[PDB]
Design a protein around this ligand. Sequence first.
Ligand SMILES: Nc1ncnc2c1ncn2[C@@H]1O[C@H](COP(=O)(O)OP(=O)(O)OP(=O)(O)O)[C@@H](O)[C@H]1O
Ligand SMILES: Nc1ncnc2c1ncn2[C@@H]1O[C@H](COP(=O)(O)OP(=O)(O)OP(=O)(O)O)[C@@H](O)[C@H]1O
Ligand SMILES: Nc1ncnc2c1ncn2[C@@H]1O[C@H](COP(=O)(O)OP(=O)(O)O)[C@@H](O)[C@H]1O
Ligand SMILES: [Mg+2]
Ligand SMILES: [Mg+2]
Ligand SMILES: [Mg+2]
Lengths: 386, 578, 193, 51, 471, 236
Amino acid sequence: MIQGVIQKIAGPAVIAKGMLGARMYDICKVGEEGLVGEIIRLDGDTAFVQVYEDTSGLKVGEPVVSTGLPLAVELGPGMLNGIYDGIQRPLERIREKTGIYITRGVVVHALDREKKWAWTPMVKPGDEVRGGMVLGTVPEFGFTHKILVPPDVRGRVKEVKPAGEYTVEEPVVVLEDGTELKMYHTWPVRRARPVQRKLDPNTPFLTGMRILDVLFPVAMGGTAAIPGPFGSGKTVTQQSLAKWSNADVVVYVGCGERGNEMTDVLVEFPELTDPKTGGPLMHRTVLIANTSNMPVAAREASIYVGVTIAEYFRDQGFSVALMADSTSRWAEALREISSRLEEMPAEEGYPPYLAARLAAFYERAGKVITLGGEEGAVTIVGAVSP
Amino acid sequence: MIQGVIQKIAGPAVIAKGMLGARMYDICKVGEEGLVGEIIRLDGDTAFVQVYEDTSGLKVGEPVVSTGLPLAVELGPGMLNGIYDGIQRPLERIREKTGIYITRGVVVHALDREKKWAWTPMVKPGDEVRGGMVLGTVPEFGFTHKILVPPDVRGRVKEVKPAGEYTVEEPVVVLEDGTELKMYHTWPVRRARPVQRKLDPNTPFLTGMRILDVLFPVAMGGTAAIPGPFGSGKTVTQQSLAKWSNADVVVYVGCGERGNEMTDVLVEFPELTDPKTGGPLMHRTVLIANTSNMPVAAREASIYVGVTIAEYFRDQGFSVALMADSTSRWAEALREISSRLEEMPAEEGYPPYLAARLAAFYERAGKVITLGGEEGAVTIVGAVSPPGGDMSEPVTQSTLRIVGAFWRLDASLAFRRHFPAINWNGSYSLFTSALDPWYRENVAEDYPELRDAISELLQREAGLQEIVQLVGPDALQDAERLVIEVGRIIREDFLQQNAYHEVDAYCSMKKAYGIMKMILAFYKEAEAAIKRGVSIDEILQLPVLERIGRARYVSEEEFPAYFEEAMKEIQGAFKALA
Amino acid sequence: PVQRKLDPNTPFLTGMRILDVLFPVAMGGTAAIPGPFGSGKTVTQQSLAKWSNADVVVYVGCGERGNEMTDVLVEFPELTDPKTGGPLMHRTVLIANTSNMPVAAREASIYVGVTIAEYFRDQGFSVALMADSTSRWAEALREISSRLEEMPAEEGYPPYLAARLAAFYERAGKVITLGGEEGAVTIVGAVSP
Amino acid sequence: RRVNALEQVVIPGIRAQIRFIQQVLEQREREDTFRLKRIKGKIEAREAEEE
Amino acid sequence: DLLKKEYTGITYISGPLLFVENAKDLAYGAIVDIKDGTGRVRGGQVIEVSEEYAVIQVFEETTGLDLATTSVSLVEDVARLGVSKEMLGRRFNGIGKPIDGLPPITPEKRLPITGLPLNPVARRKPEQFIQTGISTIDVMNTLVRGQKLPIFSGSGLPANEIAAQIARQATVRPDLSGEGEKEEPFAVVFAAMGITQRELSYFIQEFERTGALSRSVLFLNKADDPTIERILTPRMALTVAEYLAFEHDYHVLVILTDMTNYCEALREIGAAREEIPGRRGYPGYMYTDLATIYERAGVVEGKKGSVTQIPILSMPDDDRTHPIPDLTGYITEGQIQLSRELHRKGIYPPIDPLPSLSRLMNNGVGKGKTREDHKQVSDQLYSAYANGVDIRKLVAIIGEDALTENDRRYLQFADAFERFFINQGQQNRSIEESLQIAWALLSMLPQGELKRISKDHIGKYYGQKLEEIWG
Amino acid sequence: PVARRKPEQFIQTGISTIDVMNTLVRGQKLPIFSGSGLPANEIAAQIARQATVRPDLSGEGEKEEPFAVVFAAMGITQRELSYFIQEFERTGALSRSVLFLNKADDPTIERILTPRMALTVAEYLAFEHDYHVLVILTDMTNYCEALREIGAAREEIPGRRGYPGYMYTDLATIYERAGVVEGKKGSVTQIPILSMPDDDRTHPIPDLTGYITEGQIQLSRELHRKGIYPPIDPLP
Ligand SMILES: Nc1ncnc2c1ncn2[C@@H]1O[C@H](COP(=O)(O)OP(=O)(O)OP(=O)(O)O)[C@@H](O)[C@H]1O
Ligand SMILES: Nc1ncnc2c1ncn2[C@@H]1O[C@H](COP(=O)(O)OP(=O)(O)OP(=O)(O)O)[C@@H](O)[C@H]1O
Ligand SMILES: Nc1ncnc2c1ncn2[C@@H]1O[C@H](COP(=O)(O)OP(=O)(O)O)[C@@H](O)[C@H]1O
Ligand SMILES: [Mg+2]
Ligand SMILES: [Mg+2]
Ligand SMILES: [Mg+2]
């Protein structure tokens, strides 16, 4: 791969040299410690890397290795009932490894590679499969988890594993050309997942609050924003929506907020009851946490990871509700990163491309017809803390 | 000529190399297409050229040739009844040559070379001539055009051609040194034309609008500015001034505004009638148009061409009025050019030399004694759209210090359709005292006293309005209520003027004097009746109120009978009340 | 440097009824007397110079109008010292600046005065220091920072204005000198919003 | 009643608006000063360092 | 040549810009194709050139580009669009490529998208009055054929519904002017900058319902599309509109969905180039750039076609002093301003008549065009409404009981004016009905105070009761 | 500063509102604050035409000493130039005065250098030949604007609002030249004139002038519109 060394350090910004051949928005490994970085500039033989972890103690001359791939998540069984870092790292494995403090340089897998899952095949040899088609089902906590072909895959199948228990990284389907399909696949978080059609929202998103349901309704597949000063009740409203709403899967994103607001959700939720299945409430919830004293550059990654997971659960036919705790912290992260690049800012120091990012993020929401034929929807409620 | 090639293109800016020998502000020909450009920088062997035409499609390596002369205009017969672009090219010739669109690289002469003019000499061989002296006479519509010696020429004459018809290229003078003089000459636009002496301003510039002529006069040689937000009425006021003023020649300059406003002038004016000659109104007007979607760099050249033509018509002996559509567009053009040069700007991004340009432009206005011994005058009215929001922008502040009158417009008055919407509190004039002797002789002996009484009433009304916001109109006593009602009467009747009405569009001086006399007589009678114990409510029910309020729409020649009848009714009504 | 800073426990007898009774200031303390123009700052400051119980008096002008500085320069020598009947100028040091002096001289005016006051403190005396119009010293500081392109913070003032003001006022206090004796410095500063 | 209403409601609101507008204008002046610093630094760099 | 040249010396990629150093052969303003290492082709435009290097802005995103394998190829020196009469009923993206699945258009001509200025001699005065079916537009802010009449809107206000209603109901009245045979329908050109799926779905449904897609041409640039593509959409739309109007004698109506997004993209490009800013953030040349878009409308001497523009833009904090509404109001020929306070009371359409303005009204009204009493009625309505608003501000302070009879009459006129004249719903009103309602409202006042109307018109029309029309 | 002495003698300007209620003293810097449309030029011309010293009231009757007026005009137009020439030449007041004129179309550096030449001449006449001189500066707003243009042309970072940081020092080197010196008989008195740009006294130019000068005279707009001349407001 492309390999080079470091010659400049200033906060979370690292400039590497000898990187001729690296591509834009790739993922690099930085230093002896092995940090995670992303390239957003190219200039001659040099590259500009923003680092998603702490850069203290680095020195000039440490090696930089490029993986050649953009920032991607692992989508598959095992994401429910889980709490993840801003770049999709399970927090309880980090607790088991390091202890009570989050140190940098820890490498963990997103999905558990050692759990056995029950597999029930659907396809037959000789069948023609396309992107987004369903091949196999796996039992989860009350749900039925479907195994989907990656969207950019077409071929014919002659190999099916029989019904048994396998891990997530065993080939269950082999295509005619030799492509092996597993229970999980990876997707870059900056690309919107394909669909067939988008539909007009026509059913309400029931929140359980009188004033929001009666006077100012939001439809299944719409977007909403809730601004207000500190102490107004944004977090309590969002947590009440997580508890009581009729969505099948709830994805909660904590972007630069208090750690207590996430510990409360972690502790209290398993004792509650799911309104529409009767099981524990935590079995339907996915948590992405990046508190305020964690690295600044990881705030953007948390938002994109959350919206990518919510898009993934839409394609299975569920109805997903996404709650972003604060987008103002994401805006502050963009301001900091642009300040390291010495770009000319717009009003209040925000970069001029700030509105484009917000437009691209909210555009992911809608009621669609999935590639497999089922109907799903994603609704987004984002809190603004000005 | 100095020749070189190009290596930089970025918008309206072109940087050439190999140009050692070029001079500042020369005219260069850019590219094989032959575009017109101007030099503003010198750096070693490279020069910086701004282009007056579009630059898309040019390639690095095309030649650049310098003409060695600055930007000049052709002054002579044939400029009246014409319309020109920013660098003095007739638009009718372009319309003949091209389609409905304006393309680049069109070459046309400013003065028509085919038309033949009647020539009548005024000199004989052996005479001594000097710069600015006349020699000849050419008829042109209702005017007699005089052929002037260029200001830089002195010598003795031995040649005259007799009376005949000749083209403008025909030279009919030969001096002893052998030089030739023609019916036209070229003058650079950035050099002010010389005069013999300046004069004090002592004659009003009659605009035909009541509030401007009465309350805020401007002299014949003075300057005025009219700032206001969009939709307040600058362009309508300027076109009314173009139609109804008593200037001999009106030069109208459009700088960065809509093309429909120029089309309106092009269509309506040939139908209208000249106030002082009875001919078509378009025979006295010259238009210079550089619309908003035309190239940016030509906006400055349009202003300079307009002021140079206005100065030229002054030297013949006329009184010229100049209307500048917007100087804010000129300022924005200067800001646009300064971005390419990478300079360090002033408060709002404008270049620091902006304030000197405006002062140099406005200083050309005045009443002079020309080099030919006659008397001429140029008066400049410049509309200043406040560029961002308001009156604190540097353009308006720089304009405030060099103008003798300041007609501030208000958006709140224009919202409620109270045109002309002049803000009376924030406006002023400095030409009142000088014009006072003229008003006593030509209008009426007591006219300044009536004007002072009207201003005193408006000030009294403005004072009481603070109390009205505090307690309401019901708490005021009867005298102050009467003052408030009379102020409302003045605002509704005297100041308001509809520019699209058939009769109200123009108002002479004596009609305004009569209306002021009627209003002051009514106020005196009302105050006397207040002293006799009459309540205010029954006074306002009088039928004479409608008689005053509709005195605007009475025609000019019907007016004296109406004035006599209204005065008699004013006397009759209040004598029977108490 | 000193040995030890003591707590203030003796009053600074200003010689005025209201200031001594209602709003006293202890020796080694700091007082501020603000007010708009025409309020009465200068008269009170000069009365403090004339009538106080301080052994040595230091008077600092941060840069005044020329005629007012002329007035205070002429008026002071004519007076008499209330302690002994001698001239008042024998116990005073005068620092004088006008508005046309170099801007570096006006900024360093209050530091020279406080340094001299600290010097007399080490000998065992009690020193009263009067600063006139610290607002004009702040203006001089603002101009110096504008010369160095210091990115103004609050209105035009540099971000470190409060640090300099803290450094100036914290020099006042009753201490035990290195020689084993006791001295004090009292600072009164006039502000003109 | 009128005096009390004017003393309590109107004057503090006007004062709050005045100070808010003053703070916004001060912020804009600070931002343009920063931009001027950057462009001066850019101008002085390209004129000397290049050969 | 047999095969075209390629340039590989690229050493800069940051944001939307891209530097190449061996490219002196590219003309200024040219269009280029940027080839990825994987075979993907992206478009770009050259705006700087030198013997040293060239600067290229990229339309699409820059993900996946690298300095070792990327190459730049050349397309023609001027951005040219192929147009035809066959393109009515088609859909296109932001850069002119089909997205309806049909084969591409065979061009009759290829025209530069930047356009050329119209000669002021060749223009003519807009004259024809257009009956939009809305009283507050027909009577007080009249729209004539050939006018640029933007709509100033807020965030939650329904500008799209008003624009769709105007496009549905717009017609001319040859009978009033006596011009003879009835017109042909308008041809609609719809250009969308960054637009959500909700607004796009609403517009598509509304055009499908009335069958207007057979006459329309749509240029769509969605919210999830690349931002720099928004530079080219209005220019391509106006090129097509100009071609249709001035070469095939159509009557074209152009709708621009949100000029705010265009200004945002323009600010992005300007800030990438370190240009001198305007007032808030926007570049100093934004006035000139907007002027090349708006000023392409009008009518031309000796031709039957016409182009009418209805841009829609959102004032950010309902603020009229923002740079975008300010420059739009300086360039265009009027504005229609929506009011949030009227919207909160359930009034539709919520047009506030006082800040609204139509500059070209006087050309299209008067006798022989609509009727003889139009202008005076409009002026009297304006003055009476202004007095009503002032009296509202007065009774906010002093109280209702302290009013006289005159102020009470003006207050009741203002309330009835809003409730009946402005609130009309989805119904279609002719000009005669609107004038009748306006005269009925003015009959609530005594004849003494309406000084702006001539006594003949008062003697003819005054005295109508509103209960006959509304009861 | 140890060479100056306290001002103690008055100057009779001939205007009641200045002579009685706002007395002008030899050695004072007393600015006139005016608006935009207010007649500052007429008041300046009247003061220059009428001002004189009164030795008979002083002492036993005193011995007479010369008097002179130095006039500086910055950024004036042609109309003001003609007005001042005609005002000074029509009554013999020119015989005792010196005029420095700078038109609006003249270069800005000459505007910068204009008041310093007037003050140099005033200092020379007062302290070499024992004259009592009176210096009048026609408009300080024009001087401040020219200073801003010159500073921006030399790539200097501006100060508080738009004006350069060293403007407070630069104005001080102009105002503080006036005064009266112990051991000498002559004195210099200054009457600056300036127009408030926003018509607000919190603008930097009026604000910095209040720190250096010793008073103010303010013209009133209401008195001007009522027909009163000269419109001096006695209260502020
Ligand atoms: N619906 C509610 N019912 C009861 N108490 C409430 C409700 N909403 C808010 N509160 C109270 O107000 C507090 C507001 O805290 P919350 O975290 O919701 O505020 P916030 O606006 O999200 O602030 P932050 O910006 O700090 O995250 C709650 O902790 C609770 O005490
Ligand atoms: N004196 C007047 N009488 C009647 N109507 C007037 C008068 N003045 C202005 N108006 C009306 O107000 C409108 C103002 O438009 P106008 O072209 O004068 O604007 P402007 O303030 O000059 O703006 P800009 O040139 O910046 O677009 C006119 O079109 C006309 O409808
Ligand atoms: N103890 C006092 N007795 C009489 N007058 C006083 C006293 N203190 C202050 N004043 C008055 O207050 C006014 C302001 O004086 P001064 O302090 O010199 O100016 P400023 O307050 O502007 O600094 C003086 O005119 C003076 O007469
Ligand atoms: Mg919270
Ligand atoms: Mg106009
Ligand atoms: Mg004081």
